[PDB]
Design an enzyme around this catalytic site. Structure first.
Site, PDB file in Angstrom:
ATOM      1  N   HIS A  57      40.609  34.340  32.806  1.00  0.00           N
ATOM      2  CA  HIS A  57      41.871  35.657  33.303  1.00  0.00           C
ATOM      3  C   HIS A  57      41.108  34.719  35.083  1.00  0.00           C
ATOM      4  O   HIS A  57      40.878  35.753  34.965  1.00  0.00           O
ATOM      5  CB  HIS A  57      42.140  36.588  32.708  1.00  0.00           C
ATOM      6  CG  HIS A  57      43.173  36.582  33.309  1.00  0.00           C
ATOM      7  ND1 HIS A  57      43.881  38.027  32.789  1.00  0.00           N
ATOM      8  CD2 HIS A  57      43.919  37.330  34.584  1.00  0.00           C
ATOM      9  CE1 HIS A  57      45.627  38.106  33.837  1.00  0.00           C
ATOM     10  NE2 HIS A  57      44.771  37.655  34.760  1.00  0.00           N
TER      11      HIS A  57
ATOM     12  N   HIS B  76      40.998  34.325  38.491  1.00  0.00           N
ATOM     13  CA  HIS B  76      42.417  34.118  40.299  1.00  0.00           C
ATOM     14  C   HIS B  76      41.658  32.891  40.602  1.00  0.00           C
ATOM     15  O   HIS B  76      40.041  33.813  41.474  1.00  0.00           O
ATOM     16  CB  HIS B  76      42.968  35.021  40.960  1.00  0.00           C
ATOM     17  CG  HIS B  76      43.567  35.558  40.352  1.00  0.00           C
ATOM     18  ND1 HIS B  76      44.992  35.716  40.267  1.00  0.00           N
ATOM     19  CD2 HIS B  76      43.696  36.549  39.115  1.00  0.00           C
ATOM     20  CE1 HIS B  76      46.028  36.442  39.901  1.00  0.00           C
ATOM     21  NE2 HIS B  76      45.121  36.631  38.417  1.00  0.00           N
TER      22      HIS B  76
ATOM     23  N   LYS C  58      50.113  29.725  33.166  1.00  0.00           N
ATOM     24  CA  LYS C  58      50.974  31.053  33.027  1.00  0.00           C
ATOM     25  C   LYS C  58      52.257  31.132  33.291  1.00  0.00           C
ATOM     26  O   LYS C  58      52.299  30.814  34.289  1.00  0.00           O
ATOM     27  CB  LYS C  58      49.482  31.331  33.961  1.00  0.00           C
ATOM     28  CG  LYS C  58      49.967  32.787  34.430  1.00  0.00           C
ATOM     29  CD  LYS C  58      49.299  33.833  33.381  1.00  0.00           C
ATOM     30  CE  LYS C  58      49.321  34.825  33.372  1.00  0.00           C
ATOM     31  NZ  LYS C  58      48.524  35.762  35.564  1.00  0.00           N
TER      32      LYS C  58
ATOM     33  N   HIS D 264      53.795  34.308  34.295  1.00  0.00           N
ATOM     34  CA  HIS D 264      53.697  35.481  35.232  1.00  0.00           C
ATOM     35  C   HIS D 264      55.112  35.993  36.221  1.00  0.00           C
ATOM     36  O   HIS D 264      56.207  35.789  36.367  1.00  0.00           O
ATOM     37  CB  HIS D 264      52.962  35.660  36.653  1.00  0.00           C
ATOM     38  CG  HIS D 264      52.659  36.936  37.038  1.00  0.00           C
ATOM     39  ND1 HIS D 264      52.805  37.670  37.875  1.00  0.00           N
ATOM     40  CD2 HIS D 264      50.862  37.134  36.712  1.00  0.00           C
ATOM     41  CE1 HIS D 264      51.139  38.371  38.073  1.00  0.00           C
ATOM     42  NE2 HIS D 264      50.763  38.276  37.954  1.00  0.00           N
TER      43      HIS D 264
ATOM     44  N   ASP E  60      55.454  37.841  38.385  1.00  0.00           N
ATOM     45  CA  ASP E  60      55.617  37.436  40.178  1.00  0.00           C
ATOM     46  C   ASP E  60      56.380  36.276  40.099  1.00  0.00           C
ATOM     47  O   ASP E  60      57.302  36.448  41.226  1.00  0.00           O
ATOM     48  CB  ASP E  60      54.871  37.735  40.517  1.00  0.00           C
ATOM     49  CG  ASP E  60      54.117  39.205  40.742  1.00  0.00           C
ATOM     50  OD1 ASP E  60      53.768  40.352  40.241  1.00  0.00           O
ATOM     51  OD2 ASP E  60      53.378  39.072  42.021  1.00  0.00           O
TER      52      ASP E  60
ATOM     53  N   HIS F  75      51.848  37.704  31.553  1.00  0.00           N
ATOM     54  CA  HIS F  75      51.752  38.307  32.189  1.00  0.00           C
ATOM     55  C   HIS F  75      53.533  38.567  31.591  1.00  0.00           C
ATOM     56  O   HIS F  75      53.506  38.084  32.213  1.00  0.00           O
ATOM     57  CB  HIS F  75      51.125  38.594  33.641  1.00  0.00           C
ATOM     58  CG  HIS F  75      51.672  39.351  33.872  1.00  0.00           C
ATOM     59  ND1 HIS F  75      50.152  39.996  34.867  1.00  0.00           N
ATOM     60  CD2 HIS F  75      52.605  40.593  34.290  1.00  0.00           C
ATOM     61  CE1 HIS F  75      50.872  41.054  35.978  1.00  0.00           C
ATOM     62  NE2 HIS F  75      52.417  41.649  35.289  1.00  0.00           N
TER      63      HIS F  75
ATOM     64  N   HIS G  69      45.756  40.590  29.756  1.00  0.00           N
ATOM     65  CA  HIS G  69      45.831  41.779  29.925  1.00  0.00           C
ATOM     66  C   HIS G  69      46.650  43.409  29.351  1.00  0.00           C
ATOM     67  O   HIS G  69      47.559  43.842  29.998  1.00  0.00           O
ATOM     68  CB  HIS G  69      45.868  42.657  31.320  1.00  0.00           C
ATOM     69  CG  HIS G  69      46.600  41.774  32.042  1.00  0.00           C
ATOM     70  ND1 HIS G  69      47.886  42.074  32.148  1.00  0.00           N
ATOM     71  CD2 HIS G  69      46.693  41.022  33.271  1.00  0.00           C
ATOM     72  CE1 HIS G  69      48.946  41.042  32.519  1.00  0.00           C
ATOM     73  NE2 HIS G  69      48.167  40.685  33.521  1.00  0.00           N
TER      74      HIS G  69
ATOM     75  N   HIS H 269      50.449  46.741  45.959  1.00  0.00           N
ATOM     76  CA  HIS H 269      52.096  46.362  45.372  1.00  0.00           C
ATOM     77  C   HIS H 269      52.438  47.400  46.588  1.00  0.00           C
ATOM     78  O   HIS H 269      53.506  47.280  47.089  1.00  0.00           O
ATOM     79  CB  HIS H 269      52.538  47.107  44.606  1.00  0.00           C
ATOM     80  CG  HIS H 269      52.448  45.985  42.866  1.00  0.00           C
ATOM     81  ND1 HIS H 269      53.481  46.279  42.396  1.00  0.00           N
ATOM     82  CD2 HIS H 269      51.494  45.337  42.480  1.00  0.00           C
ATOM     83  CE1 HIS H 269      53.408  45.223  41.175  1.00  0.00           C
ATOM     84  NE2 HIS H 269      52.103  45.319  41.558  1.00  0.00           N
TER      85      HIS H 269
ATOM     86  N   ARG I 131      52.428  52.929  34.695  1.00  0.00           N
ATOM     87  CA  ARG I 131      51.908  51.370  34.529  1.00  0.00           C
ATOM     88  C   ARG I 131      50.984  51.918  34.173  1.00  0.00           C
ATOM     89  O   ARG I 131      50.010  51.567  33.253  1.00  0.00           O
ATOM     90  CB  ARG I 131      52.297  50.636  35.869  1.00  0.00           C
ATOM     91  CG  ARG I 131      51.103  49.589  35.639  1.00  0.00           C
ATOM     92  CD  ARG I 131      52.031  48.057  36.809  1.00  0.00           C
ATOM     93  NE  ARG I 131      50.850  46.936  36.001  1.00  0.00           N
ATOM     94  CZ  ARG I 131      50.831  46.115  37.228  1.00  0.00           C
ATOM     95  NH1 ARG I 131      52.017  45.533  37.437  1.00  0.00           N
ATOM     96  NH2 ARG I 131      49.744  45.996  37.595  1.00  0.00           N
TER      97      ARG I 131
ATOM     98  N   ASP J  40      39.970  38.532  35.289  1.00  0.00           N
ATOM     99  CA  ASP J  40      40.932  38.762  35.604  1.00  0.00           C
ATOM    100  C   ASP J  40      40.888  39.119  37.914  1.00  0.00           C
ATOM    101  O   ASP J  40      40.977  39.682  38.637  1.00  0.00           O
ATOM    102  CB  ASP J  40      42.123  40.296  35.529  1.00  0.00           C
ATOM    103  CG  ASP J  40      43.361  40.619  36.716  1.00  0.00           C
ATOM    104  OD1 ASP J  40      43.793  39.108  37.101  1.00  0.00           O
ATOM    105  OD2 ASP J  40      44.497  41.002  36.676  1.00  0.00           O
TER     106      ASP J  40
END
Ligand code: NI
Ligand code: NI
Lengths: 122, 100, 570
Positions: free
Chosen positions: C137, C139, C220, C222, C224, C249, C275, C323, C339, C363
């Site tokens: 995981h 980035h 992946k 996700h 978003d 995700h 996750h 966020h 969350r 992550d």
């Protein structure tokens, strides 16, 4: 209980090295004037020429001491050491070039040792 | 000031030792890197003062004691080694079991 | 002649029955078996055993059973066992686990583990040796992240990203054929193994599939980018044809569906659930229920691991800065509160301990720490031992069963999930020689030496201007494995079978070893070593309580952890 990071907690008992192999005790003398230190795994008959001992008793053997340790002989020092048998194929190549083959060829090893001046060829 | 590679790196030991000394002065028990940082800088600074290698081998065993550091820290440090420029050139100092 | 066991372990590393503490934790591992022949141990140095005519054979050429490298006296910690052996490497792969030396004069020498003129020696006596960690995981946002990962024993990075672009800062995604080709070229200069994920988003197969053909090693999904039923469905159709893994995700917002809708879109196909606890993302509040299904390969990211007194305060704020949540907006506070849940983070500790969550990951740089996957896995095992006691499966005062369950979470299980366990993920014969040596006092904290493809890549080592390598300052540094063209031979770029068949490597001029992703579509939870439990996880929608087998799963947060303030300067 106090924590020592990465400490060991060894089991009980002792480790026997070279178990089941014949052991032999011989007297060895450093006839040289500089110190000689011999490692656990050198074929014993091929050690420094100036170490006097019955060379035939070193054939096919090595020191019976913990792997990677050594016996030390000061100049003029005589002392007893204990030998154990070589294992595996029981062949030795290189080192002093006394064997280059099976350690069973004692006559050939001793002829070479005597010609080259390795002391104590009976 | 013509810094070579080692001079640049060893400035960071000194940084770290300054940081650790402030933490010790506010009452903290020191951790592993902090205690190493501190004894290494003492050694380097001692060589810059002109002490001998034998003096620093003795004194490096008295810079920090077990009550200055966290549990386990004394036992984690078997020795501390540093090279520095003495009056007679670069030499290696080893301090065996510095903290007890 | 006999040696007492304290001296024996001092000289050669521990042997059968001896135990070793992992760092400053309460966890003890016990040597289960030892491949040596007592008295013929291999060692190197002045007057030692691996010398010509002695423990080193002076007759054999390199092709005749001689090794390129012998690691002597290693205490191996692996899913396959906790045991003592020599490790022999040749052509960059592990070729022999057993007893190294010279069959001329030593007993019990493994026949392809001859030390000869061509062998280099690494002493591992007194070290613990593990596979390199596999982080699935990642980035890719800051190239400085690679040393961070190598310093904590990580040797393979799977994920996505093109640098600090917002799509990459949010999602492990390298979108499209051109971004993928660029990052495959960038990867030629990273001293670590890498696998790149494409965007698992689209409602037509071709836009997704062209990413696999371009060189992606998986996909992946996700939220978003739209974690919708269609994106899910198309990605899994592409994956089943291409033989690559899909990570997800899921839709935290429950916008197009609830968890049962995402599961219906998956339709029993294999999928890696990232996750899975859900603080890092996923259907609120019950995403962790995913970890009970047979076709889900479940992983945690590392910020929630393990549950501590600062965890919730840190996550609530972390979530609101990522966020750009506002204090003032009641919808932002309700989302945050739905969350970041103490109930599911505490239950995540226990599900790891039970073998229900099979993998860990970082992550990295998007709610995860690149150098803490390994660290936090052992912190969790230590916390669980303190709160739940020795597992029932344990024998003899040791934590071997728990150590094997937890070491599997960051080595072999991620490798199996990604379709790359034929190459990496464990210390077995026939696998790439990615090995991490650890002093026991630093285990899981700071790697001593990291071996990549049989050459050291990274090491904690001191002053380069000193007479010896141990003088200060001792710090993590890149070694000769990372330098010049050797970086190509010591590292693997993992790619889909179709890009390899289409000759993407030669198109792009890639010089790295090319690894093939395969066999990830017909595995499931049962294939996760030591972590293969399927069960009905219930998450109460009102209280967020987690129940497995009718029992609430709860534990307390801790105030202190091992592998922390004793070691770190900051
Ligand atoms: Ni995510
Ligand atoms: Ni992520």
């Amino acid at each position: 209980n106090y924590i020592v990071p990465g400490e060991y907690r060894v089991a009980e008992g002792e480790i026997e090295i070279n178990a089941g192999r014949e052991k032999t005790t011989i007297r060895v003398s450093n006839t040289g004037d500089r110190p000689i230190q011999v490692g656990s795994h050198i074929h014993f008959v091929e050690v420094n020429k100036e170490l006097l001992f019955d060379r035939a008793e070193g054939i096919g053997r090595r020191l019976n001491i913990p792997s990677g340790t050594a016996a030390r002989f000061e100049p003029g020092e005589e002392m007893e050491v204990e030998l154990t048998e070589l294992g595996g194929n029981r062949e030795v190549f290189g080192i002093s070039d006394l064997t280059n083959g099976s350690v069973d060829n004692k006559e050939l090893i001793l002829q070479r040792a005597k010609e080259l001046g390795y002391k104590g060829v009976e | 000031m013509h810094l070579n590679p080692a001079e640049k790196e060893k400035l960071q030991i000194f940084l770290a030792s300054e940081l650790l000394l402030r933490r010790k002065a506010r009452g903290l028990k020191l951790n592993y890197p902090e205690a190493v940082a501190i004894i290494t800088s003492f050694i380097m600074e001692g060589a810059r003062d002109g002490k001998t290698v034998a003096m620093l081998m003795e004194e490096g065993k008295h810079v920090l004691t077990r009550d200055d550091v966290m549990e386990g820290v004394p036992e984690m440090i078997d020795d501390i080694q540093a090279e520095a420029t003495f009056p007679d050139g670069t030499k290696l100092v080893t301090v065996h079991n510095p903290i007890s | 002649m006999k040696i007492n066991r304290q001296q024996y372990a001092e000289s050669y590393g521990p042997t059968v029955g001896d135990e070793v503490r992992l760092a400053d934790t309460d966890l003890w591992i016990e040597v289960e078996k030892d491949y040596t022949t007592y008295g013929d141990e291999v060692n190197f140095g002045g007057g030692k055993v691996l010398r010509e005519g002695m423990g080193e054979n002076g007759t054999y050429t390199r092709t005749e059973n001689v090794l390129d490298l012998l690691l002597t006296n290693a205490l191996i910690l692996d899913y396959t066992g906790i045991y003592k052996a020599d490790i022999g490497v040749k052509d960059g792969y592990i070729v022999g686990i057993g007893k190294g030396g010279n069959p001329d004069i030593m007993d019990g020498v493994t026949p392809n583990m001859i030390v000869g003129t061509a062998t280099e020696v690494i002493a591992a006596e007194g070290k613990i040796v593990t596979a390199g960690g596999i982080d699935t995981h990642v980035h890719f946002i800051n190239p400085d992240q690679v040393d961070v990962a190598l310093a904590n024993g990580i040797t393979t990075l799977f994920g996505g990203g093109t640098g600090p672009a917002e799509g990459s800062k949010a999602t492990t995604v390298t979108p499209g054929p051109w971004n993928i080709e660029k990052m495959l070229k960038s990867t030629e200069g990273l001293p670590i193994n890498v696998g790149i994920l494409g965007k698992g988003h689209g409602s037509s197969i071709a836009p997704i599939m062209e990413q696999i053909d371009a060189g992606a090693a998986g996909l992946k999904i996700h939220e978003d980018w739209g974690a919708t039923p269609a994106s899910i469905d198309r990605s899994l159709t592409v994956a089943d044809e291409a033989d690559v893994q899909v990570a997800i995700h899921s839709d935290t917002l429950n916008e197009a569906g609830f968890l049962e809708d995402t599961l219906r879109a998956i339709n029993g196909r294999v999928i890696h659930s990232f996750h899975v606890e859900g603080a890092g993302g996923g259907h609120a509040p019950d995403i962790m229920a995913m970890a009970g299904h047979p076709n889900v390969l479940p992983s945690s990211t590392n910020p929630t691991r393990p549950f501590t007194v600062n965890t919730i305060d840190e996550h609530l704020d972390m979530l609101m800065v990522c966020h750009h949540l506002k204090n003032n907006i009641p919808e932002d506070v309700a989302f945050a509160d739905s969350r970041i849940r103490p109930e599911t983070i505490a239950a995540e500790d226990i599900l790891h301990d039970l073998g229900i969550i099979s993998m860990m990951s970082t992550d990295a740089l998007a709610m995860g720490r690149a150098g803490e996957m390994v660290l936090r896995t052992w912190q969790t095992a230590d916390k669980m031992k303190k709160q739940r006691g020795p597992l029932a499966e344990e024998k003899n005062g040791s934590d071997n069963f728990r150590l094997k369950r937890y070491v599997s979470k960051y080595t072999i299980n991620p490798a199996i999930a990604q379709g790359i366990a034929h190459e990496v993920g464990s210390i077995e014969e026939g696998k790439f020689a990615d090995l991490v040596l650890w002093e026991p006092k630093f285990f899981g904290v700071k790697a001593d030496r990291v071996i990549k493809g049989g050459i050291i890549a990274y090491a904690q080592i001191g002053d380069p201007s000193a007479s010896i390598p141990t003088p200060q300052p001792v710090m993590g540094r890149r070694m000769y494995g990372t330098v010049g063209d050797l970086i190509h031979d010591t590292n693997i770029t993992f790619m889909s079978k179709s890009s390899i068949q289409q000759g993407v490597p030669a198109k792009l001029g890639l010089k790295r070893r090319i690894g093939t992703v395969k066999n990830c579509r017909n595995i499931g939870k049962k294939d996760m070593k030591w972590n293969d439990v399927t069960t009905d996880i219930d998450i109460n929608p009102e209280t967020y309580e987690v129940k497995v087998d009718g029992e609430v799963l709860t534990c307390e947060p801790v105030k202190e952890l091992p592998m922390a303030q004793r070691y770190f300067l900051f």
